[PDB]
Design a protein around this ligand. Structure first.
Ligand code: CL
Ligand code: CL
Ligand code: CL
Ligand code: CL
Ligand code: CL
Ligand code: CL
Ligand code: CL
Ligand code: CL
Ligand code: CL
Ligand code: CL
Lengths: 99, 99
Protein backbone atom coordinates (compact mmCIF):
# COMPACT_ATOMS: atom_id res chain seq x y z
CA UNK A 1 0.00 0.00 0.00
CA UNK A 2 0.73 3.69 0.04
CA UNK A 3 0.35 4.97 3.57
CA UNK A 4 -0.02 8.66 4.36
CA UNK A 5 1.04 10.17 7.68
CA UNK A 6 -1.60 12.54 8.80
CA UNK A 7 -2.54 9.91 11.41
CA UNK A 8 -0.40 7.29 13.14
CA UNK A 9 0.43 4.60 10.60
CA UNK A 10 -1.28 1.65 12.35
CA UNK A 11 -1.77 -1.52 10.26
CA UNK A 12 -3.28 -4.91 10.82
CA UNK A 13 -0.75 -7.72 11.39
CA UNK A 14 -1.22 -11.41 11.71
CA UNK A 15 1.04 -14.13 13.24
CA UNK A 16 -0.51 -17.62 12.87
CA UNK A 17 -3.98 -17.20 14.24
CA UNK A 18 -3.24 -14.02 16.12
CA UNK A 19 -4.70 -10.93 14.45
CA UNK A 20 -3.38 -7.69 16.01
CA UNK A 21 -2.47 -4.09 15.06
CA UNK A 22 0.91 -2.36 15.16
CA UNK A 23 2.54 1.02 14.28
CA UNK A 24 4.88 1.21 11.30
CA UNK A 25 7.85 2.97 13.08
CA UNK A 26 10.77 4.14 11.04
CA UNK A 27 12.29 5.32 14.34
CA UNK A 28 12.48 1.78 15.65
CA UNK A 29 15.31 -0.61 14.75
CA UNK A 30 13.37 -3.70 15.85
CA UNK A 31 9.82 -5.08 16.05
CA UNK A 32 8.28 -5.37 19.47
CA UNK A 33 4.83 -6.86 20.19
CA UNK A 34 3.17 -7.25 23.59
CA UNK A 35 0.02 -9.24 22.84
CA UNK A 36 1.22 -12.29 21.05
CA UNK A 37 2.51 -15.76 22.01
CA UNK A 38 4.88 -18.04 20.20
CA UNK A 39 6.00 -21.55 20.86
CA UNK A 40 9.46 -22.83 21.15
CA UNK A 41 12.90 -21.46 21.92
CA UNK A 42 13.84 -17.81 22.18
CA UNK A 43 16.85 -15.67 23.29
CA UNK A 44 16.58 -12.99 26.02
CA UNK A 45 17.27 -9.41 24.92
CA UNK A 46 17.33 -6.11 26.67
CA UNK A 47 15.65 -3.07 25.18
CA UNK A 48 15.24 0.35 26.61
CA UNK A 49 11.94 0.92 28.33
CA UNK A 50 10.58 2.38 31.54
CA UNK A 51 13.00 1.93 34.51
CA UNK A 52 16.05 1.65 32.27
CA UNK A 53 15.95 -1.78 30.63
CA UNK A 54 13.22 -4.21 29.84
CA UNK A 55 13.75 -7.90 29.22
CA UNK A 56 11.95 -9.23 26.04
CA UNK A 57 12.07 -12.52 24.18
CA UNK A 58 13.71 -12.64 20.76
CA UNK A 59 12.07 -15.16 18.34
CA UNK A 60 13.77 -15.70 14.98
CA UNK A 61 12.35 -16.61 11.50
CA UNK A 62 8.80 -15.70 12.50
CA UNK A 63 6.25 -15.63 9.61
CA UNK A 64 4.15 -12.46 9.92
CA UNK A 65 1.73 -10.74 7.64
CA UNK A 66 1.77 -6.91 7.66
CA UNK A 67 -1.03 -5.04 5.93
CA UNK A 68 -1.55 -8.21 3.85
CA UNK A 69 2.13 -8.76 2.89
CA UNK A 70 3.91 -11.83 4.22
CA UNK A 71 7.47 -11.64 5.45
CA UNK A 72 9.68 -13.64 7.77
CA UNK A 73 12.00 -12.16 10.39
CA UNK A 74 12.74 -11.45 13.99
CA UNK A 75 10.06 -10.50 16.44
CA UNK A 76 10.64 -9.33 20.00
CA UNK A 77 7.89 -10.23 22.48
CA UNK A 78 7.47 -8.25 25.73
CA UNK A 79 6.33 -5.07 27.31
CA UNK A 80 6.04 -2.09 24.97
CA UNK A 81 3.80 0.98 25.12
CA UNK A 82 2.54 0.23 21.61
CA UNK A 83 3.02 -2.71 19.27
CA UNK A 84 5.68 -1.52 16.80
CA UNK A 85 6.88 -2.81 13.44
CA UNK A 86 10.49 -1.70 13.09
CA UNK A 87 12.96 -1.35 10.33
CA UNK A 88 14.03 -5.01 10.48
CA UNK A 89 10.65 -6.04 9.04
CA UNK A 90 10.03 -2.99 6.96
CA UNK A 91 13.23 -3.90 5.09
CA UNK A 92 11.75 -7.36 4.39
CA UNK A 93 8.69 -5.66 3.05
CA UNK A 94 10.77 -3.53 0.75
CA UNK A 95 9.23 -0.51 2.33
CA UNK A 96 10.39 2.99 1.48
CA UNK A 97 9.66 6.56 2.59
CA UNK A 98 8.85 8.65 -0.49
CA UNK A 99 8.42 12.43 -1.00
CA UNK B 1 13.57 11.05 -2.65
CA UNK B 2 12.93 7.38 -2.12
CA UNK B 3 14.44 6.35 1.19
CA UNK B 4 15.09 2.71 2.07
CA UNK B 5 15.17 1.46 5.65
CA UNK B 6 18.06 -0.86 6.03
CA UNK B 7 19.76 1.94 8.00
CA UNK B 8 18.26 4.70 10.14
CA UNK B 9 16.63 7.21 7.82
CA UNK B 10 18.78 10.25 8.72
CA UNK B 11 18.53 13.26 6.36
CA UNK B 12 20.09 16.67 6.16
CA UNK B 13 17.86 19.54 7.31
CA UNK B 14 18.36 23.24 7.21
CA UNK B 15 16.67 26.09 9.19
CA UNK B 16 17.99 29.53 8.09
CA UNK B 17 21.72 29.17 8.30
CA UNK B 18 21.66 26.13 10.54
CA UNK B 19 22.54 22.92 8.71
CA UNK B 20 21.83 19.80 10.84
CA UNK B 21 20.70 16.16 10.49
CA UNK B 22 17.56 14.48 11.79
CA UNK B 23 15.78 11.07 11.72
CA UNK B 24 12.60 10.70 9.67
CA UNK B 25 10.38 9.10 12.43
CA UNK B 26 6.97 7.82 11.53
CA UNK B 27 6.61 6.90 15.23
CA UNK B 28 6.81 10.53 16.27
CA UNK B 29 3.82 12.87 16.17
CA UNK B 30 5.97 16.01 16.36
CA UNK B 31 9.38 17.36 15.30
CA UNK B 32 11.94 17.87 18.02
CA UNK B 33 15.42 19.37 17.48
CA UNK B 34 18.08 19.99 20.14
CA UNK B 35 20.80 21.88 18.27
CA UNK B 36 19.04 24.81 16.75
CA UNK B 37 18.09 28.35 17.83
CA UNK B 38 15.23 30.53 16.72
CA UNK B 39 14.35 34.08 17.46
CA UNK B 40 11.15 35.42 18.75
CA UNK B 41 8.16 34.15 20.68
CA UNK B 42 7.40 30.54 21.49
CA UNK B 43 4.93 28.52 23.66
CA UNK B 44 6.10 26.03 26.34
CA UNK B 45 5.13 22.39 25.77
CA UNK B 46 5.68 19.22 27.68
CA UNK B 47 6.82 16.07 25.94
CA UNK B 48 7.72 12.75 27.41
CA UNK B 49 11.39 12.27 28.01
CA UNK B 50 13.73 11.02 30.70
CA UNK B 51 12.40 11.71 34.25
CA UNK B 52 8.78 11.87 33.10
CA UNK B 53 8.31 15.17 31.28
CA UNK B 54 10.61 17.51 29.48
CA UNK B 55 9.87 21.15 28.81
CA UNK B 56 10.53 22.24 25.13
CA UNK B 57 9.78 25.38 23.19
CA UNK B 58 7.13 25.28 20.47
CA UNK B 59 7.87 27.60 17.48
CA UNK B 60 5.17 27.93 14.82
CA UNK B 61 5.38 28.57 11.01
CA UNK B 62 9.08 27.70 10.88
CA UNK B 63 10.56 27.39 7.33
CA UNK B 64 12.68 24.23 7.17
CA UNK B 65 14.27 22.32 4.36
CA UNK B 66 14.27 18.50 4.66
CA UNK B 67 16.39 16.48 2.26
CA UNK B 68 16.18 19.49 -0.09
CA UNK B 69 12.38 20.01 0.15
CA UNK B 70 11.09 23.19 1.76
CA UNK B 71 8.12 23.13 4.07
CA UNK B 72 6.74 25.31 6.84
CA UNK B 73 5.41 24.05 10.16
CA UNK B 74 5.88 23.60 13.85
CA UNK B 75 9.21 22.80 15.37
CA UNK B 76 9.83 21.89 19.00
CA UNK B 77 13.22 22.93 20.39
CA UNK B 78 14.68 21.18 23.47
CA UNK B 79 16.31 18.10 24.82
CA UNK B 80 15.86 14.97 22.72
CA UNK B 81 18.07 11.89 22.35
CA UNK B 82 18.13 12.37 18.58
CA UNK B 83 16.88 15.15 16.32
CA UNK B 84 13.58 13.81 14.93
CA UNK B 85 11.35 14.88 12.06
CA UNK B 86 7.83 13.79 12.97
CA UNK B 87 4.61 13.28 11.18
CA UNK B 88 3.60 16.94 11.41
CA UNK B 89 6.32 17.83 8.89
CA UNK B 90 6.28 14.63 6.95
CA UNK B 91 2.64 15.45 6.14
CA UNK B 92 3.77 18.83 4.76
CA UNK B 93 6.26 17.01 2.63
CA UNK B 94 3.57 14.74 1.28
CA UNK B 95 5.57 11.83 2.48
CA UNK B 96 4.24 8.29 2.30
CA UNK B 97 5.33 4.79 3.37
CA UNK B 98 5.14 2.49 0.35
CA UNK B 99 5.42 -1.32 0.00
CL1 CL C 1 -0.61 -19.09 16.26
CL1 CL D 1 12.23 -1.18 18.84
CL1 CL E 1 19.66 -10.67 34.77
CL1 CL F 1 -3.76 -2.77 7.27
CL1 CL G 1 14.65 -9.62 10.80
CL1 CL H 1 19.16 31.22 11.16
CL1 CL I 1 8.04 13.70 19.00
CL1 CL J 1 6.03 24.38 35.75
CL1 CL K 1 19.44 14.28 2.81
CL1 CL L 1 3.07 21.57 11.59
Amino acid sequence: PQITLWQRPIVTIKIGGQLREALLDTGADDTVLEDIDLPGRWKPKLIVGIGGFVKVRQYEQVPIEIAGHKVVGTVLIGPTPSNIIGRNLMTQLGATLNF
